């Protein structure tokens, strides 16, 4: 249990547990301000002393203080109320027995309000990144799908079709679901994964050289394939434009 | 103002969110709850047991360093500590330590850090979500840029909101008679003789909605070429994109 505590130490304990503490007379005048020597900001509230508590509360807080305080009788009890100064504060109120004065023990709510504000910013940032990602995905789909230039997108490591448009589908002789994930070499008669990917890669590396001549299995069309290599998110992709050769 | 010992305990228990009284030898002597502050659970079982039992390893060391030099009447020290509750869940408290003169016990006055840690955990989670969404945008943007630029189909992307060009490829640049640098940001309607933003954007939106093969015939100002424009409209993330497909008319 708590041993005996000198008045000076009791004042210091209270002042340090609370962020801001007020002694207020029965008349409603701020008799003493005790601010936490550890807690930031406060301490310029020297000026609050001698002045009406109502002078440092919003309209809404005054009425609220009045209501919750009128009932408060001096004894074993306390009551809690959130108030706003000219910043938000949780006060626990005690009425002292000798002169009906009110001791208000304040817990500063600015730190929690501050992190909430950050969370609000965080959440708006996520909305922005999500919308912008969807906007880019849509531009990508739109440009690729509407384009009359037959194009196929191929993964350099797997040799598989990762995307294409319907114009490529027509020239290749297949529908989207057949062609997505299909090994590109295997769509052309006589080609195999190894040598075909090496051909495209070498081709893509020189601007002056002709396209590759292939025969599409499904459509039985001779086609000219023109490959371009680029990096997307680290990964190497081949973008091939295809034309009828005959 | 002078105060009786019982009220003094009550003032101190209600000024802190939670407070502990620890003997000089390190045994928890009292856990004082603040009845107006949100519950920490039943922590009364801490009483009569060592403080070291209820702190993480790092906090034990930290409490040692902060408190050991602390003298009575010689001020107080702030320290943030991680507790481990009887159910093995951790919770953070910022304490102010005083050493009491009568017996050299330590009175620890706590501010609850749970709501701050909770929000901070949400902030870290949000960063992670943003990062994943950013990387995905880079992939899409890279693909979009290469596809648009490589495509021989002449295309101009127009903002529905402003009627200004937001992108195009060089096949479109050639037909319009301009370089990228001059066309980006430019009002699309003003590229074409006798056309105006309001009527032109309306015509494009209405035609797109009709799903028609009939183009708009226009005369490009810079190149003086007769062109055929087929619009399509796409909606993403609460705004619209007008895609103009362009062909020479002759």
Author numbering:
A (entry chain B): 6 to 91, 98 to 257
B (entry chain A): 8 to 257
Paste lines from the article.
The redox-responding transcription factor PpsR (photopigment suppression) from Rhodobacter sphaeroides is such a multi-PAS domain-containing protein. PpsR acts as a repressor of photosynthesis and tetrapyrrole-biosynthesis gene expression by binding to palindromic DNA sequences (TGTc-N10-gACA) present in the promoter region of PpsR-regulated genes. Additionally, the function of PpsR is regulated in a blue-light- and oxygen-dependent manner by the antirepressor AppA that, together with PpsR and its cognate DNA, is able to form a light-sensitive ternary AppA–PpsR2–DNA complex.
Phases for PpsRN-Q-PAS1 were obtained by MR using the PpsRQ-PAS1 dimer as a search model. Since the dimer arrangement of the PAS1 domain was virtually identical in both crystal forms, we obtained excellent phases and could model the remaining parts of the Q-linker and the N-domain into the electron-density map. Owing to the protomer crossing, the N-­domain and PAS1 domain of a single protomer are located on opposite sides of the dyad axis. The functional relevance of the observed dimer architecture is supported by a large number of contacts, which lead to a total BSA of 6180 Å2. The highly conserved Q-linkers form a ∼57 Å long coiled-coil-like structure which connects the N-domain dimers to the PAS1 dimers. However, neither tailing nor a reduction in the elution volume of the eluting peak was observed during PpsRN-Q-PAS1 purification, suggesting that PpsRN-Q-PAS1 is not able to form tetramers even at high concentrations. Additionally, the observed PpsRN-Q-PAS1 dimer organization appears to resemble a general architecture for the connection of PAS modules with a variety of effector or sensory domains.
